[PDB]
């Protein structure tokens, strides 16, 4: 189910058993659904006959290769089944080894006899600000079951096993996103897309020539300057880590669901890595860094390759957000991206239409596990996951 009208009818065999609010329920409290556990199941959950658990050491290059192969062949597609995310090994290390990462939380499923990797789910630690509470949580990502094992109820077992492994470490809340509606979204966001190379996007069927509009007309509409306009824009450097951390922390206070990053976490998530993460800061005529923009790299295989930038965190205190995002588009164009993607969260609705983004067909639902709180509009969500 991808809409709240489809989810209105369904029943949820697994999620009814979990500490999440009911889909109908309207919530006006803030806090855990169930108490922290003082005794945790020591044995892994039972898998179907012929499968076994395995913690994936991603510092092993052959194991990392097994994971991105599983993901590139079996992870998230567009609902038209035209494009699948193409996760690089280096991107996965970025997403899966932030500060505090644990090997037991890179949780694989393998065929017993052949050791073939056929399932995965991960947790990474994060301090999360939710309304008036700060909690240590984990972020769950990359739940993946091999296409030939789909619909055999392996997903709930992966969820219960990563839950157990996170409980063993004393953590009892999680945050996660999904394109499907489950009990119960804390917020719902929409993806928007900004064409950068319209000839390629229409050719590969990512977009279509709009009503009574030529190709030549479409390139003109999406044409961008060759260089950014904001004075003082430059790549983030090591010396910028503290001020980027300061800028981000103060800026995120206006939203209701945000990460709380240490300075080491800021370094990991924002320090530029070619073909993974780009961060540019604005250093003004006084030498003060006053703003920054960032986007990560996630190409898609055309089931060539579709080179997509995803808006990450953008902080403005002296440059208008509108101007900052214009330069983000210019930079992504310069770096050879075909499309620039952004959600309607934080303040993004103030620039999406102005900058000629077009709305997409998917929903991104945000969820908290074992935390019951009021839902929020997209503009109060201040958390971006990979």
């Amino acid at each position: 189910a991808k809409t709240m009208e489809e989810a209105s009818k369904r029943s949820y065999q697994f999620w009814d058993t979990q500490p999440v609010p009911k889909l109908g329920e309207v919530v006006n409290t803030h806090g855990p659904v169930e108490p922290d556990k003082d005794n945790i199941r020591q044995e892994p959950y039972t898998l179907p006959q012929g499968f076994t658990w395995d913690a994936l050491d991603l510092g092993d290059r052959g194991v990392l290769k097994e994971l991105y192969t599983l993901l590139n062949e079996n992870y998230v597609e567009d609902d038209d089944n035209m494009f699948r995310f193409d996760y690089s090994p280096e991107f996965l290390l970025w997403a899966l080894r932030p500060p505090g990462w644990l090997p037991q939380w890179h949780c694989g499923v393998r065929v017993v006899s052949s050791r073939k990797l056929v399932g995965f789910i991960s947790a990474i630690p994060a301090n999360i600000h939710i309304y008036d509470t700060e909690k240590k949580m984990v972020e769950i990502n990359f739940l993946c079951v091999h296409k030939k094992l789909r619909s055999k109820r392996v997903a709930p077992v992966l969820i219960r096993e990563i839950t157990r492994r996170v409980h063993l470490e004393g953590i009892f809340q999680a945050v996660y996103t999904a394109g499907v509606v489950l009990p119960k979204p804390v917020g719902t966001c929409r993806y928007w897309h900004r064409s950068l190379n319209p000839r390629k996007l229409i050719e590969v069927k990512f977009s279509h020539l709009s009503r009574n509009m030529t190709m030549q007309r479409t390139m003109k509409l999406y044409r961008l300057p060759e260089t950014p306009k904001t004075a003082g824009l430059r790549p983030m450097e090591t010396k910028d880590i503290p001020v980027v951390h300061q800028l981000l922390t103060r800026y995120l206070k206006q939203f209701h669901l945000t990460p709380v990053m240490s300075q080491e976490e800021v370094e990991h998530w924002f320090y530029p890595q070619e073909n993974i993460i780009d961060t540019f800061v604005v250093e003004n005529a006084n030498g003060e860094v006053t703003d920054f923009l960032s986007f990560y790299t996630l190409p898609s295989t055309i089931m060539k390759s579709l080179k997509a930038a995803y808006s990450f965190y953008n902080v403005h205190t002296q440059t208008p957000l509108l101007d900052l995002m214009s330069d983000a588009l210019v930079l992504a164009k310069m770096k050879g991206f075909d499309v620039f993607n952004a959600l309607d969260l934080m303040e993004n609705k103030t620039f999406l239409e102005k900058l000629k983004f077009g709305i997409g067909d998917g929903n991104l639902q945000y969820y908290l596990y074992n935390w019951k709180c009021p839902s929020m509009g997209a503009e109060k969500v201040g958390l971006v996951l990979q």
Binding site: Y75, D80, A178, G179, H193, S195, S207, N341, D361, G362
Partner: peptide, 7 residues
């Protein structure tokens, strides 16, 4: 995660 395209 969600993969979207222009509507």
């Amino acid at each position: 995660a969600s993969f979207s395209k222009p509507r």
